Amino acid sequence: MATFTTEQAGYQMQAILQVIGYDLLIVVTGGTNPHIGDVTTLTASTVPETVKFPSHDGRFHKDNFISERMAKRIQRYLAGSCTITAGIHVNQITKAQIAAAAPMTDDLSRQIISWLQAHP
Amino acid sequence: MATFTTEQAGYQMQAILQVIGYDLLIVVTGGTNPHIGDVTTLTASTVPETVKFPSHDGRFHKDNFISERMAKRIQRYLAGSCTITAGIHVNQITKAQIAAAAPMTDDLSRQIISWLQAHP
């Protein structure tokens, strides 16, 4: 249904939003290698819950800070269920990139909130 | 990336598949009202796990039998993580529709397996 991008100092993240009835599905990725490392689910009135996927070396992917952050930002605007995937390869990128991805996620979230307000 | 439909005695289900890098995202819906009631996650080597969304009257949605069934059918063909949503309003449809949706899910799953084998 809709694609958004955000950029901070050369690093780019993207969010693809799909409206499935009253329910939402959002894929958040970054850099040049799309991936799903974590999934966070929520409704307007329940606390978001995360499932982590295993990485190749056995560690769980820690990209859930992205999906949980977006979940917290958009929660009050949800008409139904919401499923958010995240994957920016936090196990491979620099600490500065990981830190920058938090305000970048806030920017994608506001872009999404605006789009939802314009397409209720 | 790809859409599939299946039909049994007038009832239709649909699966939208998205390839996100090596990872998969599949939305399974049915009838005339798309929805996400449940989410099942898996990899080729881990048992699928489900999160259920609450319905309006407080009962968890029970459409996860759909996503878990598809997960079991396609698991051995996965290159990475896989996230499957399901929602056919099992809390509103007839018992016969609920029962028919299980072989319909197997048909969508094979359609997906074929598409994956043709687009590795």
Author numbering:
A (entry chain A), B (entry chain A): 1 to 120
Give the text the authors published on this PDB structure:
Previous studies indicated that the small protein LpdD (lp_0272) is associated with the UbiD-type gallate decarboxylase LpdC (lp_2945) in Lactobacillus plantarum. The crystal structure of the purified LpdD reveals a dimeric protein with structural similarity to the eukaryotic heterodimeric proteasome assembly chaperone Pba3/4. Solution studies demonstrate that LpdD protein specifically binds to reduced prFMN species only. The addition of the LpdD–prFMNH2 complex supports reconstitution and activation of the purified E. coli apo-UbiD in vitro, leading to modest 3,4-dihydroxybenzoic acid decarboxylation. These observations suggest that LpdD acts as a prFMNH2-binding chaperone, enabling apo-UbiD activation through enhanced prFMNH2 incorporation and subsequent oxidative maturation.
Given both H35 and H61 are strictly conserved, we made LpdD H35A and H61A variants to test for the effect of an intact metal-binding site on prFMNH2 binding. In the case of the H35A variant, crystals belonged to a different space group (P41212) containing only one molecule in the asymmetric unit. As with the WT structure, a functional and highly similar dimer can be made by applying crystallographic symmetry. The H35A monomer superposed with rmsd of 0.35 Å to the Mn2+-bound WT LpdD, with significant conformational changes observed in loops spanning 8 to 11, 30 to 36, 54 to 62, and 89 to 95 encompassing most of the strictly conserved residues. No electron density for Mn2+ could be observed, but residual electron density was observed and assigned to a bound phosphate near H61. While the distinct crystallization conditions and crystal packing likely contribute to the observed changes, it is clear the presence of H35 is essential for metal binding and associated loop conformations. When tested using whole-cell decarboxylation assays, both variants displayed reduced activity when compared with WT LpdD whole-cell assays, with H35A more affected than H61A. In vitro reconstitution of the purified H61A variant reveals this mutation does not abolish prFMNH2 binding, whereas the purified H35A variant did not bind prFMNH2 under the conditions used. This suggests that His35—and by extension metal binding—is more important for LpdD function in vivo compared with H61, although neither are essential under the conditions tested.
